[PDB]
Every structure is written in C-alpha cells, then in structure tokens.
Curated annotation (Swiss-Prot):
One of its GO terms (molecular function) is 8-oxo-dGDP phosphatase activity. The keyword Transmembrane does not apply. GO terms for cellular component: cytosol. Belongs to the Nudix hydrolase family. This is 8-oxo-dGDP phosphatase NUDT18. A motif (Nudix box) lies at residues 41-62. The chain holds residues 36 to 179 of 323 of the full protein. Keywords: Hydrolase, Magnesium, Manganese, Metal-binding, Nucleotide metabolism. One of its GO terms (biological process) is dADP catabolic process.
Length: 144
C-alpha cells in the first residue's frame, strides 16, 4: 500500500457477463471526450489495489464489484504500471446518461462482438479477449 512519488499506478476493470457483454464507459475527460473505454483510473495513496479498482468502477459505472482474477499487468517504462482485473458486479446502480457528469457521461453493456465507437484506444480489444478466454476455459473445465 505504499506508492512511489513519481510512479503512475493504474487499475482497469474488464467485465464480461454470462451474456458475453462488456461494461464500457463513455469518457467525459477533455482529453478523449465521448470516446469509449473500460472503467479505469489512478490509484491513490492509502488505498489497496482492489479498493482503487472498486472506487473507479463505482465513480465511473455506479456499480459495486469484486475482482475474479488479474488478467494482465503492464508497464510503460518504469514510471507507469497498470493492473487489469476481471471483475464482476455485486450491487450498485448502473450509471446511465441520466447521471452524465465529469466522472463519466454514461456506462453501458455492449456485446463483446459489437463494441461501440469510437474507442479511446484499441488496447482494450486484447484485454477483452483475455477475459473471453478465461470465461471459455471456466465453462469448459474438461474433467474426464
């Protein structure tokens, strides 16, 4: 729970439902306004990694969640790190266009196979595939 001063630590949530839908958010940030991404943001000092994840999901999408696995850990140089969790919903209220504000314009569930446009960046396509693969394996355990 101690963070280095000149390091940026990011958490990102991939939700992939039993109906093969992904939870996306429509960015209110001026630097990518109206583009679509996954719930994500920067860890704050004093929070655990999973507390950060839950806060960002709640702020951006309105939902309560729990992590199911860590799907990917990425660095971009030594001063940027991202923890990409698979998460699942455990309560809260989906934050729709009714609540449009500076945290997010809306949150919405889209078919993994028919994602909205424009996407903020195309790295989440791979992160979503990781989730699809984990879900596939979980439903096909292959016990003889």
């Amino acid at each position: 729970v101690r963070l280095r001063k000149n390091v940026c630590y990011v958490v990102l949530a991939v939700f992939l439902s039993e109906q093969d839908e992904v939870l996306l958010i429509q960015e209110a940030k001026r630097e990518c306004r109206g583009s679509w991404y996954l719930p994500a943001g920067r860890m704050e000092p004093g929070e655990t990694i999973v507390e950060a994840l839950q806060r960002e999901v709640k702020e951006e999408a309105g939902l309560h969640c729990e992590p199911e696995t860590l799907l990917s850990v990425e660095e971009r140089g030594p001063s940027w790190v991202r923890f990409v969790f698979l998460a699942r919903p455990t309560g809260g209220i989906l934050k729709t266009s009714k609540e449009a504000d500076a945290e997010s314009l809306q949150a919405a569930w889209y078919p993994r196979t028919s994602l909205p446009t424009p996407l903020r960046a195309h790295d989440i396509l791979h992160l979503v595939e990781l989730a699809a693969q984990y879900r596939q394996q979980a439903r096909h355990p292959l016990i003889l």
